Amino acid sequence: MENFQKVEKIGEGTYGVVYKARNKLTGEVVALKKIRTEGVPSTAIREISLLKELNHPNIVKLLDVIHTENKLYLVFEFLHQDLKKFMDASALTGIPLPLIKSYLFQLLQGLAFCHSHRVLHRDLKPQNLLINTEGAIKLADFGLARAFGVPVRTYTHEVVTLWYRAPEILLGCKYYSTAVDIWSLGCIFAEMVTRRALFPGDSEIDQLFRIFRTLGTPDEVVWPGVTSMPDYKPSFPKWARQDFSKVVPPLDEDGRSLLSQMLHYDPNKRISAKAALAHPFFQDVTKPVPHLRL
Ligand SMILES: CCC[C@@H]1CCc2[nH]nc(C(=O)NN)c2C1
């Protein structure tokens, strides 16, 4: 880009480098993502361009999409910190429950919105949840997975995390439903509460087996059709399901109930974002402000 003074390199995304930049004309500060190449499928460009109309307060705004000289630039609204960095910074004391609740509530609203427009994220993780000083949290990179797919390694060869991946994806499902995002958010909810990743898998089978060890090896009883999935193996070990009281202490029964519904094995049974917003857990939701040192 020629009309963008690039303040700094913010990070490295799944698809490309991210810079903090200042638009010389509007003076606005944005997050500029630079992506890759055999001409780049125009099918992706159309899909991505449609995201410019997917506007919501809990969705990072996509300001522009520019395809030029073998590169694809995505211009996004800028937020000062991501949830991964905030959780690390809050590791010693933990994120207060009221803020955890507020963040989950807002993330579900963002999901409810995109899902109602038939757009899935598919690769939700702390790294793409951005926060500001106002107490808001927004989902970034929504819709990019439908356009580019989720690779095994990023453009820098970094391993794309499997920690938040729904079991139906790990088992080979061809079609992803909105339920995949609810699963990822549930894993993130648990991580905020316990200050440790729920299922820190370091391979696809380790990821699947960690899920099984906590939630029990799935069977036709809890997940009709699971034994017919592409990568299901009758030889998977059979682990017993653990009590959520042991999984996310010391979260209260309302939060444990909601998390259990977000982590149902059967995608068709997993709670929707819309239904989750009405869960008793959010009865006393508020909008606290985090302490951010920028
Ligand atoms: C998930 C990585 C891509 C995001 C796109 C939107 C976005 N907005 N701000 C940032 C940022 O990193 N600020 N420190 C990002 C990064």
Swiss-Prot record:
Its EC number is 2.7.11.22. GO terms for cellular component: Cajal body; centrosome; chromosome, telomeric region; condensed chromosome; cyclin A1-CDK2 complex; cyclin A2-CDK2 complex; cyclin E1-CDK2 complex; cyclin E2-CDK2 complex. One of its GO terms (molecular function) is cyclin-dependent protein kinase activity. ATP binds at residues 10-18, 33, 77-79, 82, 125-128, 141. Changing P41L: In a glioblastoma multiforme sample; somatic mutation. Pfam families: Pkinase. The record marks K9, K84, K85, L162 as: CDK7 binding. Residues 4-282 form the Protein kinase domain. CDD domains: STKc_CDK2_3. The keyword Transmembrane does not apply. InterPro entries: CDK, Kinase-like_dom_sf, Prot_kinase_dom, Protein_kinase_ATP_BS, Ser/Thr_kinase_AS. The keyword Ribonucleoprotein does not apply. Changing Y15F: 2-fold increase in activity. The modification Phosphothreonine is found at T14, T156. The active site is at D123 (proton acceptor). Mg(2+) binds at N128, D141. Keywords: Acetylation, ATP-binding, Cell cycle, Cell division, Cytoplasm, Cytoskeleton, DNA damage, DNA repair, Endosome, Kinase, Magnesium, Meiosis, Metal-binding, Mitosis, Nucleotide-binding, Nucleus, Phosphoprotein, S-nitrosylation, Serine/threonine-protein kinase, Transferase. Binds 2 Mg(2+) ions. The modification N6-acetyllysine is found at K6. It is an enzyme of class 2 (transferase). Belongs to the protein kinase superfamily. CMGC Ser/Thr protein kinase family. CDC2/CDKX subfamily. Serine/threonine-protein kinase involved in the control of the cell cycle; essential for meiosis, but dispensable for mitosis. Phosphorylates CABLES1, CTNNB1, CDK2AP2, ERCC6, NBN, USP37, p53/TP53, NPM1, CDK7, RB1, BRCA2, MYC, NPAT, EZH2. Triggers duplication of centrosomes and DNA. This is Cyclin-dependent kinase 2. It comes from Homo sapiens. The lineage of its organism: Eukaryota, Metazoa, Chordata, Craniata, Vertebrata.
